[PDB]
Design a binder for this molecule. Structure first.
Ligand SMILES: Nc1ncnc2c1ncn2[C@@H]1O[C@H](COP(=O)(O)OP(=O)(O)OP(=O)(O)O)[C@@H](O)[C@H]1O
Ligand SMILES: [Zn+2]
Lengths: 513, 224, 74
């Protein structure tokens, strides 16, 4: 019942009249704005494309939690992700600073057809009930494009975020990340950078970041913070001697001790910078996030030996090194590590920082993964961070079997009116819990069984067995070839031989009576 | 597992060895070949515990090994006893290679030679094992511990995947036979007359097949 | 720097526990100096402090000179 723009206009109206910053800080308009803003959900809604790369004209609607794109090679799977990256680049640039250019469209990315003149992209972002839209365009060579871009809507969102973050500290911001393919300030305080592109298989840099963070953590656990701890320890002992141990001027001594302890402890603890994002809380929050993602382990720690140092992980009753992990485990390790690092650094106020909002784009999630790993990645991703929007592209049929049919789109190519263009379809069945080949045959519409020459004799033999013919010499020699290639005890051969016994027994019993 | 019908003793070369010699490694290749010949004759071509095929229709040969029902260290008096010999597959996660690295009371184990295993277990269509009800506490203890020590009832994968695949591959014969039986009882005939004939034919067609007991149990239940 | 971090690792862990408990006993002894010097509870507390000190001296740094860490750095 509190629209975002209504509270925005009320706030900036009261802010224009009053020049007292302290009074405005406690104004109920600010509290209303913050309360309504926090409950909103940042989800993209629709994407429109025109004459971009192979794509001529298309409009796609996205889900709110998960969306999977399935297709062959050269079907525009990456084009959608690059389109969304260009859309989000301008919003991020305006967020950082007003009237800052984003990223443009390369000349070679325009369609190569004769009659093309310009290319444009349109988008729509929905926040609860507030809506916004943006359109970007470029012209091939000297033509007449659709004038210029349309950024009016995005500047309102950027102004809203700037205004909210200017008055109240430690606010929240949306997350935008894109894990691309090979191709080729709080962030500045520790080591991190503000870029939208991050690459996997960079385990060395994350390893060095982890050890450096652990070193700063340990440095911070010493020094002046020990003195406060010592005082607290004395406070516990003295109060005990005055109140607890005294009862196994006692009352006066106990009251004086408790009052002095409370006053000193409160004065010392309050003095200094708040918790915020000190290295101690970052280290343990990241470690606990990684431990939550992978419950098969017990603990992870860094050990300084007599002549070296290494990271130790305990699983079951075995201690393993970070360097004994396979490529897939390292890829998952760095992916989750970077995601957790960004989420912690973006929500310094929430009690559980894993409840932020944002959108994540992943291309070819099944890279360097064993089949047993592919069957559990989606559930963990969608359960560790339950308030984020995911857009994923994939190639393996094993991943598809764990995804509900509501959030899968299939890209095809058909020719209409003499022009070839791509189309988007949906599966005709529920593909959550089906086997491997059922998911391959339905979710992708390919052939699960290869077309090898050896299978030809099996198909011909089985067909010959249908129209009763298992007495001809041709059938005998085909059976000889089949029995030579596979063997007597191959399950397929036994199943083939079963039919013969069924027919023979059928006519036997039929003639018996 | 099934009830193994032990025959008259044929240890042969095993009689030549004695307690003083011990030295199980000292057994010759010819002695092992003779023992395997007898074991193959008595056991068929399937594993004692998991009933997985252990010998092909004779370059690569399926891994197999000789197992002792009772541990050699504790029960060395039965090192060369004929009744303590068994044949097991080479799977590194079940059967003999898994029994060694476990702690259990021997007195509470099921022996295929002594008692019929069909009174405890009952397989299902999807490949899991269900313990029968109405058994005493001692029997429930043995049934519950033999599966745990033999790793024959995993949560997923392992033997269950193969058992499921075998059943789903053999389901067509069961469906056809039960259809024929239903048709033959919808016209009129003696129940025991048709029942003996179908049972005889089905038993004849299931000889020497992998996991023949699971398909056996899956057959009676559907049968009227 | 490799030496320095090793000292920090030894500076933490169970070395803190004996550091804290002994400090608490020292505080209690200081309180005994005050309150006009006040068996029973006093005897038990003194015996517990003596036992804790005996246990820590018994450890003797666990590896004694072998532990090194801080001693090597200094
Ligand atoms: N300038 C262009 N004009 C027309 N078509 C183009 C142009 N540039 C690229 N294409 C088309 O783009 C197709 C490949 O698109 P894209 O990179 O999206 O494929 P993909 O297989 O989905 O990608 P990826 O393997 O990166 O996920 C090519 O088959 C080509 O026909
Ligand atoms: Zn076996």
């Amino acid at each position: 019942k509190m629209n975002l723009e209504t509270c925005y206009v009320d706030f900036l109206e009261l802010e224009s009249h009053v020049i007292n910053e302290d009074y405005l800080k406690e104004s109920v308009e600010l509290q209303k704005l913050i309360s309504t803003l926090n409950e909103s959900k940042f989800h993209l809604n629709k994407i429109g494309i025109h004459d971009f790369k192979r794509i001529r004209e298309l409009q796609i609607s996205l889900e709110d939690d998960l969306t999977v794109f399935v297709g062959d090679n050269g079907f525009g799977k990456s084009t959608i992700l690059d389109a969304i990256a260009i859309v989000l680049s301008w919003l991020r640039s305006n967020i950082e600073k007003e009237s800052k250019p984003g990223t443009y469209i390369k000349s070679h990315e325009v369609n190569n057809s004769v009659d093309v003149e310009y290319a444009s992209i349109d988008a729509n972002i929905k926040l609860k009930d507030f809506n916004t839209s943006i359109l970007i365009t470029k012209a091939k060579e000297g033509a007449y494009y659709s004038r210029n871009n349309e950024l009016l809507g995005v500047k309102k969102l950027a102004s809203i975020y700037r205004l909210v973050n200017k008055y109240v500290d430690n606010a929240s911001l949306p997350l935008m990340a894109y894990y691309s393919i090979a191709r080729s300030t709080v962030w500045s305080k520790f080591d991190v950078y503000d870029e939208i592109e991050f690459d996997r298989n960079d385990f060395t840099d994350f390893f060095q970041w982890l050890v450096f963070l652990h070193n700063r953590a340990s440095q911070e656990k010493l020094s002046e913070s020990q003195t406060t701890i010592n005082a607290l320890f004395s406070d516990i002992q003295s109060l005990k001697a005055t109140l607890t141990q005294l009862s196994a001027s006692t009352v006066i001594k106990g009251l004086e001790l408790s009052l002095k302890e409370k006053l000193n402890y409160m004065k010392s603890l309050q003095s200094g910078e708040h918790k915020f994002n000190n290295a101690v809380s970052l280290y343990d929050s990241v470690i606990n996030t990684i431990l939550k993602f992978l419950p098969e382990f017990q603990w992870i720690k860094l050990v300084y030996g007599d002549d070296d140092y290494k990271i130790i992980l305990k699983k079951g009753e075995v201690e393993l090194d970070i360097q004994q992990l396979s490529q897939g485990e390292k890829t998952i390790f760095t992916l989750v590590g970077d995601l957790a690092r960004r989420l912690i650094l973006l929500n310094p106020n929430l009690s559980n920082p894993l409840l932020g909002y944002g959108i994540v784009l992943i291309d070819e999630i099944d890279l360097h993964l064993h089949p047993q790993w592919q069957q559990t990645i989606i559930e963990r991703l969608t359960s560790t961070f339950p308030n984020v929007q995911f857009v994923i592209t994939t190639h393996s049929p094993q991943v598809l079997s764990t995804v509900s049919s509501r959030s899968v789109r299939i890209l095809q190519e058909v020719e209409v009116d003499g022009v070839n263009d791509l189309i988007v379809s949906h599966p005709d069945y529920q593909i959550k819990g089906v086997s491997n080949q059922d998911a391959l045959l339905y979710g992708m519409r390919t052939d699960p069984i290869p077309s090898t020459k050896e299978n030809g004799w099996l198909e011909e033999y089985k067909k010959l067995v249908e129209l009763n013919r298992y007495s001809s010499d041709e059938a005998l020699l085909l059976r000889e070839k089949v029995i030579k290639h596979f063997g007597l005890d191959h399950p397929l051969v036994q199943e083939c031989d079963d039919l013969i016994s069924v027919l023979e027994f059928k006519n036997k019993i039929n003639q018996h009576f | 597992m099934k009830y193994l019908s032990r025959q008259m003793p044929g240890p042969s070369v095993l009689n030549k060895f004695d307690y003083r010699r011990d030295d199980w490694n000292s057994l010759s290749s010819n002695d092992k070949k003779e023992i395997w010949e007898e074991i193959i004759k008595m056991q068929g071509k399937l594993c004692a515990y998991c009933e997985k095929k252990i010998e092909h229709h004779k370059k690569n040969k399926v891994e197999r090994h000789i197992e002792h029902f009772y541990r050699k260290s504790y029960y060395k008096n039965l090192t060369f006893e004929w009744s303590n010999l068994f044949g097991s597959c080479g799977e590194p996660q079940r059967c003999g290679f898994y029994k060694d690295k476990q702690k259990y009371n021997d007195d509470d184990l099921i022996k295929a030679d002594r008692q019929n295993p069909d009174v405890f277990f009952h397989f299902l269509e999807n490949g899991d094992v269900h313990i029968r009800e109405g058994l005493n506490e001692k029997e429930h203890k043995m049934a519950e511990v033999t599966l745990r020590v033999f790793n024959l009832n995993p949560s997923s994968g392992g033997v269950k995947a193969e058992r499921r695949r075998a059943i789903e591959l053999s389901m067509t014969l069961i469906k056809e036979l039960v259809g024929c039986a239903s048709q033959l009882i919808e016209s009129g005939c003696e129940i025991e007359d048709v029942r003996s004939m179908v049972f005889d034919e089905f038993k004849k067609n299931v000889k020497d097949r992998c996991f023949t007991t699971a398909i056996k149990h899956v057959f009676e239940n559907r049968m009227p």
